[PDB]
Amino acid sequence: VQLVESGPGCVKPSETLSLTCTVSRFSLIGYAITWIRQPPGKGLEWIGGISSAATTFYSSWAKSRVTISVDTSKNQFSLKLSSVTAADTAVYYCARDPRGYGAALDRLDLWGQGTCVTVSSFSTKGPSVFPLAPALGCLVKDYFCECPVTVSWNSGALTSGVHTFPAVLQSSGLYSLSSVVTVPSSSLGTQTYICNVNHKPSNTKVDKKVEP
Amino acid sequence: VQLVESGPGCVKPSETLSLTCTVSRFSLIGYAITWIRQPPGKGLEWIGGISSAATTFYSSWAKSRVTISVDTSKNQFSLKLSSVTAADTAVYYCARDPRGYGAALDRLDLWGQGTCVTVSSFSTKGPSVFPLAPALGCLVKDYFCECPVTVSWNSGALTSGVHTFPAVLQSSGLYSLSSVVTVPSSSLGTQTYICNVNHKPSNTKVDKKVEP
Amino acid sequence: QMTQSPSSLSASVGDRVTITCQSIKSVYNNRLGWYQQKCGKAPKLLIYETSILTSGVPSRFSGSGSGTDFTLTISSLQCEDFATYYCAGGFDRSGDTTFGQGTKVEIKRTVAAPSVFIFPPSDEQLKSGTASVVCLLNNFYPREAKVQWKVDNALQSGNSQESVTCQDSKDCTYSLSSTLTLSKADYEKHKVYACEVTHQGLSSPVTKSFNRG
Amino acid sequence: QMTQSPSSLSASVGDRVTITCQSIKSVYNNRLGWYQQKCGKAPKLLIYETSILTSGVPSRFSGSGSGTDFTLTISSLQCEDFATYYCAGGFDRSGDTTFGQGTKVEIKRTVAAPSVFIFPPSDEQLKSGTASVVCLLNNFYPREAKVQWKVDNALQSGNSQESVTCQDSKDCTYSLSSTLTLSKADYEKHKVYACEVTHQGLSSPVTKSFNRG
Amino acid sequence: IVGGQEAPRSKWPWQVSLRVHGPYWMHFCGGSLIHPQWVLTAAHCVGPDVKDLAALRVQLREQHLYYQDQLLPVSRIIVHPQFYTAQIGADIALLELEEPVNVSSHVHTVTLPPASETFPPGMPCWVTGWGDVDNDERLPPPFPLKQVKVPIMENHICDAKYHLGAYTGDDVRIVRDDMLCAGNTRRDSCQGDSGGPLVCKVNGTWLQAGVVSWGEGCAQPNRPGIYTRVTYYLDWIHHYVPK
Amino acid sequence: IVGGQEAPRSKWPWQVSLRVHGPYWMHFCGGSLIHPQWVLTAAHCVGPDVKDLAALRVQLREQHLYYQDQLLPVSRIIVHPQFYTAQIGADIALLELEEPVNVSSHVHTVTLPPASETFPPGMPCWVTGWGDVDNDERLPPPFPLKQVKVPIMENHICDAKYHLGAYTGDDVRIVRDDMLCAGNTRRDSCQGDSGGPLVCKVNGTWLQAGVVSWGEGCAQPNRPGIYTRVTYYLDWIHHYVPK
Amino acid sequence: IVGGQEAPRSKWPWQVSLRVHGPYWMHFCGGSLIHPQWVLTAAHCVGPDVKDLAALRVQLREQHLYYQDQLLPVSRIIVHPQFYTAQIGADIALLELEEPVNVSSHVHTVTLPPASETFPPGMPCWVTGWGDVDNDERLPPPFPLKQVKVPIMENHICDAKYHLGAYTGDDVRIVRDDMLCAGNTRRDSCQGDSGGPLVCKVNGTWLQAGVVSWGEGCAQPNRPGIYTRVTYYLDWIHHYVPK
Amino acid sequence: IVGGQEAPRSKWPWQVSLRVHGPYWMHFCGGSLIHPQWVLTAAHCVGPDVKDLAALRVQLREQHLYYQDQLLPVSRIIVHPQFYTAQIGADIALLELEEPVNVSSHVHTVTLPPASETFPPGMPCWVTGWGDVDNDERLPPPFPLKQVKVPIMENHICDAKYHLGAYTGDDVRIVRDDMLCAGNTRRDSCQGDSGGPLVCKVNGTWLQAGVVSWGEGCAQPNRPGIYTRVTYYLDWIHHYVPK
């Protein structure tokens, strides 16, 4: 029983950001939803919420610009934020209050996995991906709109020993990321060791084999 | 839902060994029990069993000397072995067949924790226990009839990092054992670090504090 | 508005720690909660209504407080307790509710020297006129590591970046990836390449290298 | 009567292994099972009736066979797969049923030098005229370690014993405790005491010592 | 409700349904809206053991259960300190709503009686609810709000009837003074009406005389229903509800 | 068993009870001991889906269920390959006991008929079991083995009765030839007697004519009980059971 | 319906509810309006035994059961002459309404397929009903019409799956040719959906491929639901329904 | 009985089973034989409403319910005049047998305590019965008499525990002085043990300390079982039973 966010991932300034949150089984009848924001490096800030009675509550600043709504015909909750600006770049979460209160933060029992939103003037760009010679690893480089990047190895069957590193800005203003595993020398070849990569902000999916 | 063995732990030659096995909830009605033996360093050998129908089966050698029985008034199964000799030294287990077959080994789903039995002419003797100076550890030494020895630290609250070593024969024909933990230097004193020891074949219970 | 203290703390496996949260006003009617956020994940509720433990949470955690001042306390640090922690509370109905600033908890454990590797630029980079050389440190402790880059014994400066995992849920160590960027026209200028880790768990600098062809 | 093969095997974490069991006769009607025994514990049933997986067992294990020949197979070695394994089967009803001899499975992992310690005889031993000096190796790999005892640079011989844990469920390393016995009358003869581990993960012997008072 | 009709679509704007969590938000108890933020109900619906407020919701007047729900959250529960079981007394409780209610032509508060009112026999009183329609019979799947007009009995005449066919000595008071009796073999509250209001039309105004509390089965001979007498508890109610 | 008495303490030494695991080893189906190692029963008690033998036990003749149990384990289940549902046919099955049974003055095997026997109407036949005593009524807590003597009908007369009050076209055969009909509105098998034996006394010897299989309720008008006709399956039985 | 959503308020104008008399007119079976005076349904909902028409009513499309009912009377029931049980086949029936229905933007007839249509796998098909939502779980008290999109299987692949984990010999055909298979462990019809339509969108037009008939539980592994194949019975339907 | 073993075949010769008429003489309540013509039991098993004596029987000690019954008729029922419900007190009653009982090695009377006995904590006390074995679990079909040894609590410590997790004000006494507390989360009486004896071994002699009366569920945390304290009622008992 879980929530899922959805959102555009990348937006330009002055558009309106729209987010949705969907409940995967059981209805929503009887429950409140709140929207929480986490700017990079900051802690958590509260946007607002809607009670089980359909009353909406908004934090101090959000009242000027935010609307929260529910559509029982779609099993969805929706957040809309007008006139977005760069300072709105954050991870956004939806969470449930089991008491149905519209404005409380002490008992958020169930959370979505979060959605990251970037406000920027730039274009998206798809990444390049290169193998790294066998420890062994894989590298993905120079992409932009970073958050929805995902790495997986042998369709994920190499569940174990996989590290992955925080992306860093190249001086070119583009992000790069690396993925690594440690393995016994005999396991070489024995395993397929496929680096699989996708970057949702450019609809990109790509794959590569690793070898010496 | 579990079995428990019981037994004397130490016996002399030519007595009869008696063992019992008890089922802790739910009755036994409908179920078979088998007795399995494991000599030191050997694998597993099958003694015999009793079916849900109360038919008894015995392995080739056991037929000369063994009796298996059930007493519903006590919720117990019992094994008796006559004329014991040193070669009978082993761990003994009771295990359940869920089909109620009296003579099958392919589906022993539920096992007792086992009981160790030593056949010897010697006397039992209680151990001495000495602290070991702070890594830190504890040592117990020169005891006999070894199997039911148990070590526990701070009533067991030091659940973590505790190692314990296989007992070895001193040339004096008596067993010794050691117990060790690794800890950060600041944790010293902060914790009680009590070595608790008991040796059931001499009814002994003893405790000691550790300090530099 | 609320304060949470300390902003960070650092304690040994097995040990006990406490975290405090205070307010100018008083929670409405026991409306205060504690959340655990691990790196890369949504927050998890631990304690609600001052002291009720959430199901499936191990009884290591406990909490108490008095309308204006509240404490969260562990009985014993495990490795996976590495996380940030937040208080949250509500001071009325319909209005003033907020989170605290958060607290970062570090596990301390047996020191370990980094496992060191180095890698040449692979094919496709050279086919694009770019290059990048990777040097890697694993499972070290503490974080105080410094890597020099040296090329044909020419100490390098700038042109390089580092990234570090959060501390592991299970081993409680971490890995660090360092990379030196280069053009193809400068990669061909030099043949022998080395990186040299300094780490508090080493008696000296130790160099690991390869050479171009 | 049955045979099980191989008697031992040694494979890397992540990898796949297979174990075979054979018979002179044929199992009665799919009556064959596989058990896992860890050090210091009763056997656990894994597979019964040739191929049915027991609940709560991870689907890494699989088994198949043909009346006379049977195989148990892992999909991927974890650390806690360290154990002995036995086939068992029945060739009629009421009669001929037996276990196999068993197979021992070793995890291979990143080598590690032993963590070394040494300890003086404590009070109560001296109050009994006995002594014992403990030297300790932890979490090393492989098992090939040798410890010399040296006292006032006089190499010791005999008078000492070693004991080793089984390989850990979780770290898959092990610890070894070595102890040198002595009388009080000989403990007072010598002042400086040393133990010196040789291990395949060391560039040399390394000595750790203390001195009497 | 045993006997009686379906209720007109504008006749008891103060009726409340209490819902418990499960596979659906099931009705289990009644109440009445007495102030825009307060609901009056029976103690045995919510105590004596403490309940998690996550499991509870309030639903305001609607003609049919479940058809168009708007579940209000509850901020606090208050049970009279002297309650342990219904037969002993003090079976009265208060719910405080998280959010206040807009009074509207569909939803309006009932009025509490002055402490001097006695409600003698012969007055016109009604009880309303969604409870069982007969001794073992659930209300059928459309679930309309039902109503019935009941008679009132003096306490001593009611206490005497409860002694008929019982071993209890007739010195031992069964119906206490904080209680009230109503109904007969054709007309009664029943299971699931508990906590609902009993109202009487006095001098043109509807007053809540009682709360459905307990009884020895539904519509059984010589067993009138027992109601908590609201006038007995006015001082306790006005310590929390803003008059 | 609908109608009929309790059974003498020595009258059906071949009756078997089938037990399923749970909070206790509950009776769910009947059978008969036909060879010291084989039990004959209905297919729909054990199939068409495969069962874990851990969940099953056999109990031999006893006057009262549960009172003094000695649960035998089962080594193998054999269901006729052509069985999917009872109304289609081949509702017959075999259980092989792990351990053979000592024939004794309390426990003896029933005899199977010769392939030429037809069991015409008028013969004296009985059915015995621990099933429900009326259409929705469980057998009471002492649980005695009951017996009733039933009449036999020819198949075509039975098939005709099943068409009374039904939409089924009377060209469409309901009662097949591997089936047999017995009973009436006063005397029948019922739920939980399934798999039990139907026996007839021929020339002084008890023969098993049938196995309780299916019917449209218990003792209902124009709905005799349907039994699997044992003579139809002798060749299949003797392929496993040592004659 | 296991899985799936609530249905839009204009998506299956042909859906029918069958009601049985009792304490209230309870839903027990589905159907579809195929002609302004004819309803198509499953035979096992109404036969094989004859029913008193006093006990039956039809209710046309409504979003929520019971909330706004308009019970139509039934003039005649027609069951296929070859039906006795579902597993054998011919599980199909017709109801003739007393009064014809005004076709309207809320109520319109479904179209029957041409005899040549086969409905191969990969087509988009849905089943709709008010039946149980999980294996033992009643549909909750608001009672909305649910819908789910199911996959289609070829008969031989379906028959093979039914043999997995069964004693039945794999020469013995379980799924006959007058039948059709659909669904999987996440998506199925269930109890109380019986008799409902299965529809597929072919060349922009909705055609009724099947009628919910039988299955081995809801959403169980290797047990797809079985539907009566409508094209097999067109000649029988057109003998009563005016084309 | 929650927890505990089965009982030796000679250990509580005073245990009584109360039977109610129906499809069979079903066990519903316990008692103890205190005089060859008198049974002691709980009031709530038989009152407060008067019962027809035609519907009641007594059965003396037997190892298994129903297997060998000898139902004794009852001549008179006496309920304490101050009883209406258990939580209020005086939950005690007497049955007078029509025919006196032969004292025998299988059946002997329990002894009542002297008025000065208090039964402080630490004493060895047992409760015995045929009631449910867990919170919703009936005793399985063999129906053995079960026994468990319980701890004793002082009343004030027991009253305090009943206030944990409750809205009741801790000035309001729940456990009265005519009551006694015993048991814990692993060991308790349960439904159908009501009216049974609680006995303690004092100075080698078994004395009946209490009668199973009421509690908030079986084995629940901070809810010990409540027993009627026999010493409080000795003067009332000796007004009818010949000492």
Contact check, Cβ <8 Å, F67/H65: no
Q: Are the C-beta atoms of residues G163 and G174 closer than 8 Å to each other?
A: yes
Output the six-digit token pair for B152.
């526990």
Do strands G38-41 and G93-97 pair parallel, antiparallel, or not at all (unpaired)?
Answer: antiparallel
Output the six-digit token pair for E17.
């349904």
How far apart, in whole angstroms, are the C-alpha atoms of residue A206 and residue B3?
Answer: 56
C-alpha pair distances (Å), G68 with each of E68, G71, G106 = 13, 10, 14
How far apart, in whole angstroms, are the C-alpha atoms of residue H118 and residue H98?
Answer: 34
Touching chains E and C? (3+ Cβ pairs < 8 A) = yes
Kindly list the residues from chain G whose CB atom is less than 8 angstroms away from the CB atom of residue E142.
24, 66-67
**DSSP states of G131-196 as a string?**
S-SBTTBPPPTT-BPEEEEE-EE-HHHHHHHHHTTB-S-TTS--S-TTEEEE-BTTBB--TT-TT-
C-alpha pair distances (Å), B64 with each of B67, B92, D92, H15 = 9, 19, 22, 48
* Contacts with E156 (C-beta within 8 Å, 6 or more apart), sequence order: none
How far apart, in whole angstroms, are the C-alpha atoms of residue B139 and residue E64?
Answer: 77
Output the six-digit token pair for H210.
């209490």
Q: Residue B129's closest CA among H225, D38, D123?
A: D123
**Does residue A29 come out as left (phi exceeding 0), alpha (psi in the -120 to 50 range) or beta?**
beta
Nearest-10 Cα torsion for F223, F224, F226, F227: 170
* Contacts with H161 (C-beta within 8 Å, 6 or more apart), sequence order: H153, H222, H223, H224
How far apart, in whole angstroms, are the C-alpha atoms of residue B106 and residue D21?
Answer: 13
How far apart, in whole angstroms, are the C-alpha atoms of residue F53 and residue D52?
Answer: 14
Task: Enumerate neighbours of F (3 or more CB pairs within 8 A).
Answer: B, D, G, H
CA R_g for chain F: 17
H-run or E-run covering E159: helix E155-163
Kindly list the residues from chain B whose CB atom is less than 8 angstroms away from the CB atom of residue F25.
29-30
Kindly list the residues from chain B whose CB atom is less than 8 angstroms away from the CB atom of residue F99.
51, 53, 55, 102
C-alpha pair distances (Å), B155 with each of B146, B189, B191, B192, B208 = 21, 16, 12, 10, 11
- Looking at the complex, report in whole angstroms how far the Cα of residue A25 sits from the nearest Cα belonging to chain C: 20
- Residue of chain B with shortest Cα separation from C109: B184
How far apart, in whole angstroms, are the C-alpha atoms of residue B110 and residue D141?
Answer: 35
Q: Residue A143's closest CA among A122, A157, A160?
A: A122
Q: Which residue has tokens 């409760």?
A: H127
C-alpha pair distances (Å), B203 with each of B9, B125, B127, B168, B173 = 12, 10, 11, 21, 21
**Does residue E159 come out as left (phi exceeding 0), alpha (psi in the -120 to 50 range) or beta?**
alpha
Q: Are the C-beta atoms of residues B44 and B111 closer than 8 Å to each other?
A: no
Could you tell me if E53 lies within 8 Å of chain A, comparing CB atoms? yes
Q: Are the C-beta atoms of residues E105 and E171 closer than 8 Å to each other?
A: no
CA R_g for chain G: 17
* Contacts with A68 (C-beta within 8 Å, 6 or more apart), sequence order: A33, A35, A48, A49, A50, A56, A58, A77, A78, A79, A80
Contact check, Cβ <8 Å, F166/G81: no
Task: With H, G, I as helix, E, B as strand and everything else as coil, classify residue E220.
Answer: coil
C-alpha pair distances (Å), B192 with each of A212, B160, C11, C110, D176 = 55, 14, 18, 21, 25
Backbone angles phi, psi at G160, to 5 degrees: -60, -40
Cβ within 8 Å of H, F 55-94: 64-67
Q: For chain B, how long is the longest CA-to-CA vector?
A: 63
Q: Which residue has tokens 């302004």?
A: G36
Q: Are the C-beta atoms of residues D13 and D80 closer than 8 Å to each other?
A: no
DSSP 3-state percent helix, strand, coil across chain E (nearest 5): 10, 35, 55
Q: Which residue has tokens 């802690």?
A: A43
Tell whether omega for the bond before A8 is within 30 degrees of 0, i.e. cis: no
Secondary structure letter of residue F69 according to DSSP = -
Could you tell me if B40 lies within 8 Å of chain D, comparing CB atoms? no
- Overall residue count recorded for chain C in this entry: 213
* Contacts with C45 (C-beta within 8 Å, 6 or more apart), sequence order: A107, A108, A109, C33, C34, C35, C54
Give me the long-range contacts of H151-154 (CB less than 8 A, separation at least 24). Answer: H151/H121, H151/H125, H151/H182, H151/H183, H151/H184, H151/H187, H152/H119, H152/H120, H152/H121, H152/H122, H152/H123, H152/H125, H152/H180, H152/H181, H152/H182, H152/H200, H153/H121, H153/H181, H153/H182, H153/H224, H154/H120, H154/H121, H154/H181
CB-based burial label for B172 (10 Å; 0-12, 13-18, 19+): exposed
How far apart, in whole angstroms, are the C-alpha atoms of residue F22 and residue H137?
Answer: 12
In angstroms, how far is CA D73 from the centroid of its own chain?
Answer: 21
Output the six-digit token pair for C5.
């203290």
Residue type (1 letter), E157: I
- Looking at the complex, report in whole angstroms how far the Cα of residue D131 sits from the nearest Cα belonging to chain F: 59
C-alpha pair distances (Å), E36 with each of A69, B179, E102, E109, G22 = 25, 69, 7, 7, 41
- Looking at the complex, report in whole angstroms how far the Cα of residue B79 sits from the nearest Cα belonging to chain F: 21
How far apart, in whole angstroms, are the C-alpha atoms of residue A178 and residue A136?
Answer: 11
C-alpha pair distances (Å), D197 with each of D138, D210, E211 = 11, 15, 85
Do strands G225-229 and G205-214 pair parallel, antiparallel, or not at all (unpaired)?
Answer: antiparallel
Output the six-digit token pair for H109.
């009377």
Contact check, Cβ <8 Å, F64/H65: no
Within 13 Å of residue E80, how many CA atoms lie on the same side as its CB?
Answer: 27
Q: Are the C-beta atoms of residues C97 and C77 closer than 8 Å to each other?
A: no
Within 13 Å of residue D111, how many CA atoms lie on the same side as its CB?
Answer: 9
Task: With H, G, I as helix, E, B as strand and everything else as coil, classify residue E101.
Answer: coil
Output the six-digit token pair for F49.
């889906």
CB-based burial label for A48 (10 Å; 0-12, 13-18, 19+): buried
How far apart, in whole angstroms, are the C-alpha atoms of residue F229 and residue F210?
Answer: 5
Please state, as a whole number, how many other Cβ atoms lie within 10 Å of the Cβ of residue E77.
Answer: 19
Q: Are the C-beta atoms of residues H198 and H206 closer than 8 Å to each other?
A: no
Q: Are the C-beta atoms of residues E98 and E76 closer than 8 Å to each other?
A: no
Task: With H, G, I as helix, E, B as strand and everything else as coil, classify residue F181.
Answer: strand
Q: Are the C-beta atoms of residues G131 and G139 closer than 8 Å to each other?
A: yes
Q: Are the C-beta atoms of residues B36 and B45 closer than 8 Å to each other?
A: yes
Q: Are the C-beta atoms of residues B20 and B31 closer than 8 Å to each other?
A: no
Nearest-10 Cα torsion for B71, B72, B78, B82: 10
Backbone angles phi, psi at C162, to 5 degrees: -130, 150
How far apart, in whole angstroms, are the C-alpha atoms of residue E73 and residue E57?
Answer: 5
Extract the runs of DSSP E, i.e. beta strands, from D30-153. Answer: 32-37, 44-48, 52-53, 61-65, 69-74, 83-90, 97-99, 103-108, 115-119, 130-140, 145-151
H-run or E-run covering F192: none
Q: Evaluate the CA torsion angle F53, F58, F64, F67 in order and state its sign.
A: negative
C-alpha pair distances (Å), B12 with each of A44, B7, B65, B167 = 72, 13, 17, 22
Task: With H, G, I as helix, E, B as strand and everything else as coil, classify residue E156.
Answer: helix
Could you tell me if D73 lies within 8 Å of chain B, comparing CB atoms? no
Q: Which residue has tokens 């309540």?
A: H29
In angstroms, how far is CA G133 from the centroid of its own chain?
Answer: 16
Secondary structure letter of residue H116 according to DSSP = T
Backbone angles phi, psi at E71, to 5 degrees: -75, 115
Q: Are the C-beta atoms of residues E118 and E177 closer than 8 Å to each other?
A: no
Q: Are the C-beta atoms of residues B195 and B208 closer than 8 Å to each other?
A: yes
Secondary structure letter of residue A44 according to DSSP = -
Q: Residue B94's closest CA among B48, B55, B149, B51?
A: B48
Could you tell me if B184 lies within 8 Å of chain C, comparing CB atoms? yes
| Resolution of this structure in Å | 2.5
Task: Enumerate neighbours of B (3 or more CB pairs within 8 A).
Answer: C, D, F
Residue type (1 letter), E156: H
CATH numbers and ranges of domains, chain F: 1-12+110-231 (no CATH), 13-109+232-243 (2.40.10.10)
How far apart, in whole angstroms, are the C-alpha atoms of residue B172 and residue B156?
Answer: 31
How far apart, in whole angstroms, are the C-alpha atoms of residue F58 and residue F69?
Answer: 10
Task: With H, G, I as helix, E, B as strand and everything else as coil, classify residue E232.
Answer: helix
What HEC string does chain C produce?
CEEEECCEEEEECCCCCEEEEEECCCCCCCCEEEEEECCCCCCEEEEECCCEECCCCCCCEEEEECCCEEEEEECCCCHHHCEEEEEEEECCCCCCEEECCCEEEEEECCCECCEEEEECCCHHHHCCCEEEEEEEEEEEECCCEEEEEEECCEECCCCEEEEECCCCCCCCCEEEEEEEEEEHHHHCCCCEEEEEEEECCCCCCEEEEEECC
Output the six-digit token pair for H63.
């190892």
What is the set of active-site residues of G? 44, 91, 194
- Residue of chain E with shortest Cα separation from G68: E142
How far apart, in whole angstroms, are the C-alpha atoms of residue G15 and residue G30?
Answer: 7
Tell whether omega for the bond before C120 is within 30 degrees of 0, i.e. cis: no
Touching chains A and H? (3+ Cβ pairs < 8 A) = no
* Contacts with F30 (C-beta within 8 Å, 6 or more apart), sequence order: F15, F16, F17, F18, F41, F129, F130, F131, F192, F193, F194, F195, F196, F197, F212
H-run or E-run covering B138: strand B136-143
How far apart, in whole angstroms, are the C-alpha atoms of residue D56 and residue D42?
Answer: 17
